[PDB]
Design an enzyme around this catalytic site. Structure first.
Site, PDB file in Angstrom:
ATOM      1  CB  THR A 256      -9.656  -0.128   6.414  1.00  0.00           C
ATOM      2  OG1 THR A 256      -9.229   0.397   5.151  1.00  0.00           O
ATOM      3  CG2 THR A 256     -11.124  -0.516   6.319  1.00  0.00           C
TER       4      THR A 256
ATOM      5  CB  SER B 208     -10.296   4.022   0.490  1.00  0.00           C
ATOM      6  OG  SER B 208      -9.522   5.188   0.274  1.00  0.00           O
TER       7      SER B 208
ATOM      8  CG  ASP C 155      -2.067  -1.009   1.059  1.00  0.00           C
ATOM      9  OD1 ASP C 155      -2.535  -1.220  -0.079  1.00  0.00           O
ATOM     10  OD2 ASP C 155      -2.484  -1.587   2.085  1.00  0.00           O
TER      11      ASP C 155
ATOM     12  CE1 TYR D 153      -2.641   6.611  13.930  1.00  0.00           C
ATOM     13  CE2 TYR D 153      -1.997   8.509  12.625  1.00  0.00           C
ATOM     14  CZ  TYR D 153      -1.983   7.819  13.817  1.00  0.00           C
ATOM     15  OH  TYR D 153      -1.310   8.331  14.903  1.00  0.00           O
TER      16      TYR D 153
ATOM     17  CE  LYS E  89     -10.176  -2.786  11.637  1.00  0.00           C
ATOM     18  NZ  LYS E  89      -9.533  -3.207  12.910  1.00  0.00           N
ATOM     19  CB  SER E  90      -4.992   2.237  14.654  1.00  0.00           C
ATOM     20  OG  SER E  90      -4.554   1.235  13.753  1.00  0.00           O
TER      21      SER E  90
HETATM   22  N1  LIG Z   1      -0.512   3.842  14.160  1.00  0.00           N
HETATM   23  C1  LIG Z   1      -1.014   3.437  13.003  1.00  0.00           C
HETATM   24  N2  LIG Z   1      -1.908   2.381  12.919  1.00  0.00           N
HETATM   25  C2  LIG Z   1      -2.369   2.027  11.745  1.00  0.00           C
HETATM   26  N3  LIG Z   1      -1.950   2.715  10.617  1.00  0.00           N
HETATM   27  C3  LIG Z   1      -1.088   3.726  10.734  1.00  0.00           C
HETATM   28  C4  LIG Z   1      -0.620   4.085  11.921  1.00  0.00           C
HETATM   29  N4  LIG Z   1       0.210   5.103  11.745  1.00  0.00           N
HETATM   30  C5  LIG Z   1       0.254   5.373  10.449  1.00  0.00           C
HETATM   31  N5  LIG Z   1      -0.551   4.523   9.827  1.00  0.00           N
HETATM   32  C6  LIG Z   1      -0.810   4.439   8.389  1.00  0.00           C
HETATM   33  O1  LIG Z   1       0.461   4.420   7.783  1.00  0.00           O
HETATM   34  C7  LIG Z   1       0.269   4.968   6.503  1.00  0.00           C
HETATM   35  C8  LIG Z   1       1.669   5.371   6.055  1.00  0.00           C
HETATM   36  N6  LIG Z   1       2.173   4.544   4.954  1.00  0.00           N
HETATM   37  C9  LIG Z   1       1.979   3.109   5.191  1.00  0.00           C
HETATM   38  C10 LIG Z   1       1.430   2.458   3.926  1.00  0.00           C
HETATM   39  C11 LIG Z   1       0.034   2.022   4.101  1.00  0.00           C
HETATM   40  C12 LIG Z   1      -1.092   1.666   4.237  1.00  0.00           C
HETATM   41  C13 LIG Z   1      -2.409   1.244   4.398  1.00  0.00           C
HETATM   42  N7  LIG Z   1      -3.458   1.826   3.852  1.00  0.00           N
HETATM   43  C14 LIG Z   1      -4.521   1.135   4.238  1.00  0.00           C
HETATM   44  C15 LIG Z   1      -5.814   1.279   3.988  1.00  0.00           C
HETATM   45  N8  LIG Z   1      -6.160   2.292   3.211  1.00  0.00           N
HETATM   46  N9  LIG Z   1      -6.750   0.407   4.523  1.00  0.00           N
HETATM   47  C16 LIG Z   1      -6.343  -0.579   5.285  1.00  0.00           C
HETATM   48  N10 LIG Z   1      -4.989  -0.720   5.543  1.00  0.00           N
HETATM   49  C17 LIG Z   1      -4.114   0.139   5.015  1.00  0.00           C
HETATM   50  N11 LIG Z   1      -2.799   0.206   5.114  1.00  0.00           N
HETATM   51  C18 LIG Z   1      -2.033  -0.754   5.893  1.00  0.00           C
HETATM   52  O2  LIG Z   1      -1.715  -0.201   7.171  1.00  0.00           O
HETATM   53  C19 LIG Z   1      -0.444  -0.740   7.559  1.00  0.00           C
HETATM   54  C20 LIG Z   1       0.523   0.435   7.675  1.00  0.00           C
HETATM   55  O3  LIG Z   1       1.859  -0.012   7.477  1.00  0.00           O
HETATM   56  C21 LIG Z   1      -0.025  -1.638   6.422  1.00  0.00           C
HETATM   57  O4  LIG Z   1      -0.594  -2.925   6.620  1.00  0.00           O
HETATM   58  C22 LIG Z   1      -0.704  -1.002   5.269  1.00  0.00           C
HETATM   59  O5  LIG Z   1      -0.851  -1.961   4.223  1.00  0.00           O
HETATM   60  C23 LIG Z   1      -0.545   6.181   6.788  1.00  0.00           C
HETATM   61  O6  LIG Z   1      -1.294   6.526   5.625  1.00  0.00           O
HETATM   62  C24 LIG Z   1      -1.476   5.683   7.865  1.00  0.00           C
HETATM   63  O7  LIG Z   1      -2.699   5.308   7.271  1.00  0.00           O
END
Ligand SMILES: Nc1ncnc2c1ncn2[C@@H]1O[C@H](CNCCC#Cc2nc3c(N)ncnc3n2[C@@H]2O[C@H](CO)[C@@H](O)[C@H]2O)[C@@H](O)[C@H]1O
Ligand SMILES: Nc1ncnc2c1ncn2[C@@H]1O[C@H](CNCCC#Cc2nc3c(N)ncnc3n2[C@@H]2O[C@H](CO)[C@@H](O)[C@H]2O)[C@@H](O)[C@H]1O
Ligand SMILES: Nc1ncnc2c1ncn2[C@@H]1O[C@H](CNCCC#Cc2nc3c(N)ncnc3n2[C@@H]2O[C@H](CO)[C@@H](O)[C@H]2O)[C@@H](O)[C@H]1O
Ligand SMILES: Nc1ncnc2c1ncn2[C@@H]1O[C@H](CNCCC#Cc2nc3c(N)ncnc3n2[C@@H]2O[C@H](CO)[C@@H](O)[C@H]2O)[C@@H](O)[C@H]1O
Lengths: 257, 257, 257, 257
Positions: free
Chosen positions: D154, D151, D45, D156, D158-159
């Site tokens: 799901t 989109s 992603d 950041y 969601k967390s």
């Molecule tokens: N503390 C936290 N908890 C959760 N997410 C955090 C977070 N801090 C930051 N972020 C995310 O990091 C992204 C920065 N670039 C990472 C690349 C990406 C992505 C991504 N997009 C989605 C999506 N649209 N729907 C569902 N899953 C998704 N994923 C997965 O989230 C995981 C992140 O590595 C991987 O599994 C990814 O595949 C940012 O955009 C924040 O959204």
């Protein structure tokens, strides 16, 4: 020594119970479901709870062992014969977990919980005043409240957002069930962990009928005046034959196994 | 006895400090900010934290009093003269709260926390393995982790969904900061309450630079090999002159006052 | 025009209703509780809900006004006479909110919800399979599920951790009630917001008796085969005489007023 | 047609990119990374996000396809040749997802987010006033705020406890990061879902420096006067060659696959 075995009732647990009794017959072990010193539970956590409440009046004279056919049951079925020999040898360490005492007064009945005790209404809205050590802490409006034991924090308490809690901590945890919070109604929102000697009292506001649960038992209490929660003076004793830390079984039950 | 007073620095707290020193001059009280036996904090909780860390190496020889100008400060400014007389009389009860010990090893530095200690990354993603008593419990992915003291559970810990915790319980609580949970990444999700003698170790996975905070102090640590959390052997002692239960000040701070 | 007024039943609301009817008698307003074009509710949100369900089969021919004696009621009692004149003038704007449709099939009955509709068990454990547009999404284990309207997101949905939702968004939100999540049981955990034309179907696993609620009505349904949730084609129409944004009344109800 | 392929940079994705270009050479497909009509992303992603921002100024002239080597990437590597043929045929359906627009004014710069945009402080405490459509809704105190796309719910969002949201709903969701809630400080606590044409403005209180993130890009902005969030007029277009519902990929990513 004196012992008994309870079973989940299904085909897998009944025959496993028969094979262990036959193995115990090769040792100096007397079966006695009236005054057992060891109570073996063969089934799930619900089977273990039923075994605990069956002998809840001889806790200071019983050590419990669970066989998983399972958070409380820390023995696999394939390890049944090894458990028979170790239990026959009689050399094991005793591990004690705290329990929760619930007192219901009308216008009294006491219960003992290994997991938790919850309060809900009899159909109407749930409104109670929460009094902590004779001090009014809050007026709760919502679905209900859950007072959990340390070992029960991973059960119903965990689903309500409560904290997981090591059983070496003699304490109890209270959590909310869909609490109402607005401009007028306001609760603490956060789980509360109470030590020993602390008494939490729930007192009715309007409705006096409550659906009160203690582990798997749930009864409709009428004309309730007070529900008192406090850490019990009684403790449950486990017979442990090997190292199985609490955080390891938490890891195995929720992380991966 | 020997004493000192710290101030928030604003006009209201400075003159209040001057009036109390003048009142102490009418008694057998020697001002000494080097070896004080009583440390009076005049300000908010941040002022109280600065006073605690200023004398964090003489805790077993100091009793703290806070004046609210306030969770730790349990005295109103209008009650300042009554506090001077009671403190001059010298008859008070000593109340002790547990503390958190943080150890950082490189390729060591130790800190002491009254509220909590948190770990974040230096800009990159935060990934650490959580090891509880030499046993790998989980691999955490998210923003960070927060290890809180009992009195600190109402602070940063409360905002992260942690449970409120009575200070008579010598323990520490760990909570998550926006943890990642999907098909591959998985954490416990729930706050964890650890007793004494339990050691929680955070070990790096890729990045070895972390922004570590201890109360209000936050430093960027480089080339980190291990962050160890455990309940400290040191305790903070409060000078209490009247009954103010923990749940009452929790009620006054969050419910209503 | 044709109108009727419902009352909370207490002394304050009954006489307020009498004074408004007398004021309406000075205009060309015909009281008719059979085919009213304006339904005035005098009381709380529960009084407003009872008024909505009383005329739930003439929604496309009724505009609702609530008087707070109150999330849906956006009129103060001291403004009652000004409302009589404005309502008598007949110049107001029409605001429509989405509704939730619930269909229960046995071995069918349909309901309409302004707040939400929830499903619980008849005493036993609650286990259902969640099917979204003929696709199995999860197997839910816990206390229950709550499907909320946009205006209902600030009600029961908010207490379950759901998101607040502007009523211009024709959609519905599903939230969990103390879901079980471990190594074997696993749900999404997060609230789900579904657009129009999306159908969410709850299908029984073992027990087929469920306690289903629609706003304040709760009935025990037996031999259930399917519970279908979808955004209704029907909408509730409000008579608005002044600007009162949704986020402003959210602010006034939860932040401060 | 015109196309380009971006790669994660590792050995598995680079050679997969070379094999697809060779397969495209057997058709009427011109490689052009300046004005591509199809942008293929080979990686995770994060690789898809980098591809989106690389061509964020030709969105209304590009269709995106992701290959998982993955929430946005909905193609397996073993299906690469089948994708080449289908993409060469040129018969596919176009699916559009909403985007988030972020405007930063000083004493202006605009950004576009596919996942979310967050605001934190430059080290000090984070305090902003939240203004919804020129109306002051709350004063936020905590770690930060997160405005998410449908989109991105799901991700950041969601967390942080936010609700999952179908991309057919043109809207944005705001969630809190460890908000402070006590007797004086008070926020809504719940996620907020805003429709189109709604503008959410964050205005500084004391500190004017903020660490603002847009997807993977994070910059320290100084002397900030206003941060404006609103649903963008621009949309991202996906090239879909088979049915893959949003709730199905949510199921596969969090439930089981
Ligand atoms: N503390 C936290 N908890 C959760 N997410 C955090 C977070 N801090 C930051 N972020 C995310 O990091 C992204 C920065 N670039 C990472 C690349 C990406 C992505 C991504 N997009 C989605 C999506 N649209 N729907 C569902 N899953 C998704 N994923 C997965 O989230 C995981 C992140 O590595 C991987 O599994 C990814 O595949 C940012 O955009 C924040 O959204
Ligand atoms: N809405 C909800 N969410 C979560 N739990 C709820 C719940 N409503 C009710 N309960 C629990 O039901 C029990 C009623 N008898 C079920 C037998 C049991 C048990 C049990 N004890 C523990 C424990 N100590 N630690 C960790 N897991 C435990 N389990 C597992 O919880 C699952 C329950 O079937 C099974 O996996 C069990 O193995 C009650 O005591 C409430 O604790
Ligand atoms: N995102 C967040 N949410 C919540 N707290 C966060 C937070 N980020 C950081 N912190 C806290 O900031 C402190 C840094 N120095 C601030 C001085 C302090 C304090 C303090 N101690 C307690 C306590 N023991 N029990 C209950 N309330 C307490 N308070 C109040 O918390 C508010 C903080 O200004 C004020 O009302 C304080 O009076 C740190 O130690 C973190 O604990
Ligand atoms: N455990 C729980 N937590 C929270 N709500 C629960 C709940 N269990 C049940 N319910 C609600 O009870 C209603 C049953 N009839 C009560 C009449 C009503 C109402 C109502 N509608 C809204 C609304 N649309 N937006 C914001 N506030 C609203 N309110 C207020 O919610 C409080 C309920 O008394 C009062 O302040 C009401 O004014 C049901 O529809 C469930 O929504």
């Amino acid at each position: 020594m004196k012992y008994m075995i309870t079973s989940k009732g299904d085909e897998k647990s009944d025959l496993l119970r028969l094979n262990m009794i036959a193995g115990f017959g090769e040792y100096d072990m007397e079966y006695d479901d009236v005054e057992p010193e060891i109570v073996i539970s063969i089934g799930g956590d619900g089977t273990f709870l039923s075994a605990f409440h069956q002998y809840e009046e001889r806790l200071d004279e019983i050590a419990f062992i669970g066989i998983h056919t399972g958070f409380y049951a820390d023995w696999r079925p394939a390890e049944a014969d090894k458990l028979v020999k170790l239990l026959a040898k009689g050399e094991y360490q005793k591990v004690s977990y705290p329990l929760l005492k619930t007192t219901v007064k009308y216008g009294e009945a006491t219960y003992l919980a290994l997991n938790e005790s919850t309060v809900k209404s009899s159909g109407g809205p749930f409104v109670v005043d929460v009094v902590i050590n004779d001090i009014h802490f809050e007026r709760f409006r919502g679905d209900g409240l859950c007072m959990s034991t340390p070992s029960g924090t991973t059960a119903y308490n965990k689903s309500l957002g409560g904290a997981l809690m090591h059983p070496s901590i003699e304490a109890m945890q209270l959590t909310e069930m869909a609490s109402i919070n607005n401009r007028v109604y306001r609760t603490i929102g956060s789980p509360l962990v109470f030590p020993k000697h602390h008494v939490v009292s729930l007192q009715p506001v309007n409705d006096k009928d409550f659906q009160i649960s203690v582990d798997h038992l749930s009864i409709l209490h009428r004309d309730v005046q007070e529900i008192r929660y406090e850490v019990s003076a009684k403790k449950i004793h486990f017979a442990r034959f090997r190292s199985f830390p609490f955080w390891r079984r938490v890891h195995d039950s929720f992380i991966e196994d």
